[PDB]
Amino acid sequence: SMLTELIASNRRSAAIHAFVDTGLSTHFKDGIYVDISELSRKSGVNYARFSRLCDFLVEMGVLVSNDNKFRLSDECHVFANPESFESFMIKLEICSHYSNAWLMYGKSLFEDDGKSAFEMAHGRPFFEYLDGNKFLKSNFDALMTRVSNLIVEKLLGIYDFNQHNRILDVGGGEGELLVRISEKVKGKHYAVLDRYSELPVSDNIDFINGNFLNSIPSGYDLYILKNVLHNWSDSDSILILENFRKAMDKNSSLLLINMVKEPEFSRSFDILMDVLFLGKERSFTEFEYLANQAGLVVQETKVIDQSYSPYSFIKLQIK
Amino acid sequence: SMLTELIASNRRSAAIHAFVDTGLSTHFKDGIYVDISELSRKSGVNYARFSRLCDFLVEMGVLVSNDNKFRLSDECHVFANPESFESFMIKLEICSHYSNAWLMYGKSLFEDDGKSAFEMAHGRPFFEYLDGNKFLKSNFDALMTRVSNLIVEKLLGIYDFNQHNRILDVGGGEGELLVRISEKVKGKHYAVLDRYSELPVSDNIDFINGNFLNSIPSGYDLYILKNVLHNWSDSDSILILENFRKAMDKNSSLLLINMVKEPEFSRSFDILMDVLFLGKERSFTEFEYLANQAGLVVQETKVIDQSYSPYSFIKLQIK
Numbered sequence: 001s002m003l004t005e006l007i008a009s010n011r012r013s014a015a016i017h018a019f020v021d022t023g024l025s026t027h028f029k030d031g032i033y034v035d036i037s038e039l040s041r042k043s044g045v046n047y048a049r050f051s052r053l054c055d056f057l058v059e060m061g062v063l064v065s066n067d068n069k070f071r072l073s074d075e076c077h078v079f080a081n082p083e084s085f086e087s088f089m090i091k092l093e094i095c096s097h098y099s100n101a102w103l104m105y106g107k108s109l110f111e112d113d114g115k116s117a118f119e120m121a122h123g124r125p126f127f128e129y130l131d132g133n134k135f136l137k138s139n140f141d142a143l144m145t146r147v148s149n150l151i152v153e154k155l156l157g158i159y160d161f162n163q164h165n166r167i168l169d170v171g172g173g174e175g176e177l178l179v180r181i182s183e184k185v186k187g188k189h190y191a192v193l194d195r196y197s198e199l200p201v202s203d204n205i206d207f208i209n210g211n212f213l214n215s216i217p218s219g220y221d222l223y224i225l226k227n228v229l230h231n232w233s234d235s236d237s238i239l240i241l242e243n244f245r246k247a248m249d250k251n252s253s254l255l256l257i258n259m260v261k262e263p264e265f266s267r268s269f270d271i272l273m274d275v276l277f278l279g280k281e282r283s284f285t286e287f288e289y290l291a292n293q294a295g296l297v298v299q300e301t302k303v304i305d306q307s308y309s310p311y312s313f314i315k316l317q318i319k
Numbered sequence: 320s321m322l323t324e325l326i327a328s329n330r331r332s333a334a335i336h337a338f339v340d341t342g343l344s345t346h347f348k349d350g351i352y353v354d355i356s357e358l359s360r361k362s363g364v365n366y367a368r369f370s371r372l373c374d375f376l377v378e379m380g381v382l383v384s385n386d387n388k389f390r391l392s393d394e395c396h397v398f399a400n401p402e403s404f405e406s407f408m409i410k411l412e413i414c415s416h417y418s419n420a421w422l423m424y425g426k427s428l429f430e431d432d433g434k435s436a437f438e439m440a441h442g443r444p445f446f447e448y449l450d451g452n453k454f455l456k457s458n459f460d461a462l463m464t465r466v467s468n469l470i471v472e473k474l475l476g477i478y479d480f481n482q483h484n485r486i487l488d489v490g491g492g493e494g495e496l497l498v499r500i501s502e503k504v505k506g507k508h509y510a511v512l513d514r515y516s517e518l519p520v521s522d523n524i525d526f527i528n529g530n531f532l533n534s535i536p537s538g539y540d541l542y543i544l545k546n547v548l549h550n551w552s553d554s555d556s557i558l559i560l561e562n563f564r565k566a567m568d569k570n571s572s573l574l575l576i577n578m579v580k581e582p583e584f585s586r587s588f589d590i591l592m593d594v595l596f597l598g599k600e601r602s603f604t605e606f607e608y609l610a611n612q613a614g615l616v617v618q619e620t621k622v623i624d625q626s627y628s629p630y631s632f633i634k635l636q637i638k
């Protein structure tokens with residue numbers, strides 16, 4: 001039926017995970033047709049049982065069956081690349097920590113202690129827990145780096161970064177965004193603020209160990225906050241934007257860049273942000289409200305089309 | 320995109336789980352429109368955060384939204400009933416034990432020890448592990464009971480049970496099938512064989528602690544094996560049917576009743592059987608082959624339509 005297979009939606013994620021996490025998908029590069037019997041003899045995977053997985057991947061539209069062989073669909077070519085953001089996504093999506101967080105989601109809706117389903121499961125908030133877990137941190141930081149890399153060319157196209165002198169990326173992670181921006185926009189001061197136990201090292205990048213809940217460093221004319229606010233509540237989001245306003249002068253600009261809530265696209269990510277952070281994916285209207293409460297003004301709004309989600313580009317200045 | 324939401328299929332299962340497992344769905348009985356504002360005040364669930372879950376349930380088609388009120392869809396009325404098989408399904412579907420089994424599925428394809436992904440995760444095969452886990456056993460046995468209670472009406476309609484005298488349901492669990500048959504077909508001897516640490520109790524039902532891998536007891540003219548063989552390999556399936564042939568005389572009949580693999584329906588269940596049991600969902604042809612290898616003859620075959628899956632009804636007698 002439609003209901004029982006909807007209940008069994010997890011099986012689709014788990015099937016893809018088995019195919020990608022093992023590295024079996026990396027044998028399907030450049031849309032080649034793979035003989036499963038030969039792949040079985042080479043990789044030492046069970047032929048009969050992997051053939052049944054491939055049949056389910058064909059049903060999902062991940063594989064295509066022709067000439068008694070299988071190729072990745074045009075869309076699913078990314079699964080052949082273990083460096084792709086999709087490879088890191090599935091590795092996190094149904095990992096034990098995420099799964100155990102989802103199992104506390106129901107109970108978390110009845111609590112008023114400000115503890116996420118993740119924290120209820122693991123005993124710390126997401127980012128504080130990642131400090132002690134290499135698997136979660138490395139794979140998450142990798143995912144953020146890959147999606148940062150994808151939007152760079154689009155972001156440089158719609159806004160002039162050359163007019164600016166000193167640029168700070170707040171919660172910039174490994175600092176991929178500014179590293180790629182600096183290669184095309186030379187002769188600027190580049191800084192990246194995040195939570196570092198050991199400062200990253202990159203040519204002409206000033207890596208800052210800071211806390212955007214406490215303070216943002218002043219004396220930059222361009223600030224960037226990309227995919228941060230949907231990890232935070234309304235009050236924490238206002239506190240962050242308030243710290244920007246206190247750091248910014250009249251000439252300063254803040255580029256608030258976020259995966260934006262649009263009715264056409266799935267609410268699934270909005271729920272994931274609730275489970276992991278007690279966060280939420282916000283519309284343009286909700287982002288504008290929080291900015292106004294912090295004493296910031298919207299001077300420019302654009303929509304950036306990415307494969308996986310639409311993005312809201314919001315240029316903020318002090319009132 | 321379609322690919323990232325296919326990767327994130329697990330979020331659909333986890334959302335339904337949080338809605339049903341908490342018992343919030345039990346407030347949506349008889350297709351009534353629920354005020355989330357009132358349900359929040361009454362049950363103590365977070366209004367804003369549950370309203371967001373409801374929006375995701377509307378997207379999935381589980382809920383219908385009209386004038387800022389939510390009702391269960393005609394199809395998902397079952398979620399209002401905690402005794403429904405769908406309620407038990409989701410509670411098992413993404414439970415930690417199933418999730419941890421799925422995480423070993425990839426690695427299990429490279430092993431050849433006859434150990435399921437579940438056994439690799441938990442250290443014991445499924446049913447042996449259920450002996451020491453009441454949560455899994457009680458919910459699994461409850462699920463098998465609910466689906467047994469659904470098919471009884473159609474099964475009585477297509478086969479004359481009144482011709483028989485002594486009836487044994489092999490691997491009959493809580494014995495729901497025969498209890499329901501015995502109410503409509505009176506004056507017979509009814510027996511249920513399964514693995515019991517303590518024998519269940521029901522009026523005019525002889526519960527037997529047995530092992531169908533070792534032996535099936537002789538002296539019955541009707542044998543029933545319903546949804547057993549897809550927990551077993553081809554060799555173990557043959558061993559079970561061989562034990563039937565040894566137990567049966569020329570006058571005996573075996574009813575092999577199973578969810579049947581048809582090309583129109585999903586392969587997702589076939590993969591679940593591999594993960595949990597190293598089992599498989601078989602076609603009519605594959606079932607007939609195993610019976611022929613065991614020394615049994617097919618007298619009569621029929622298809623029984625159930626909401627969630629088609630069933631293969633196969634009447635067998637000895638060669």
Ligand SMILES: Nc1ncnc2c1ncn2[C@@H]1O[C@H](CSCC[C@H](N)C(=O)O)[C@@H](O)[C@H]1O
Pocket residue numbers: 127144145147148170171172173174193194195210211212213225226227228231
């Ligand atoms: N209190 C805090 N102070 C500074 N950075 C924080 C923080 N809490 C979380 N972060 C960082 O916020 C980031 C959110 S993920 C976004 C990373 C990057 N801006 C990108 O778009 O790809 C993580 O790198 C996390 O380490």
Ligand SMILES: Nc1ncnc2c1ncn2[C@@H]1O[C@H](CSCC[C@H](N)C(=O)O)[C@@H](O)[C@H]1O
Pocket residue numbers: 446463464466467489490491492493512513514529530531532544545546547550
């Ligand atoms: N070795 C064994 N001997 C007997 N029963 C067994 C067994 N291994 C598993 N079983 C039982 O086989 C059943 C599979 S589930 C099917 C239950 C029932 N026939 C129905 O259709 O609803 C479980 O009740 C399990 O306890």
Ligand SMILES: COc1cc(OC)c2c(c1)C(=O)c1cccc(O)c1C2=O
Pocket residue numbers: 089143147227228230231259272276308323
């Ligand atoms: C910062 O919080 C996030 C947290 C996130 O998940 C915990 C994500 C993302 C952000 C995210 O940007 C993203 C983009 C594309 C695919 C994804 O799976 C994600 C994503 O999972």
Ligand SMILES: COc1cc(OC)c2c(c1)C(=O)c1cccc(O)c1C2=O
Pocket residue numbers: 004408466546547549550578591595627
């Ligand atoms: C005995 O092995 C099973 C094992 C099973 O799962 C472990 C199931 C079933 C059988 C099963 O029959 C079933 C029917 C309808 C919905 C279901 O989720 C199931 C099911 O999960």
Ligand SMILES: [Cl-]
Pocket residue numbers: 523524525
């Ligand atoms: Cl008796």
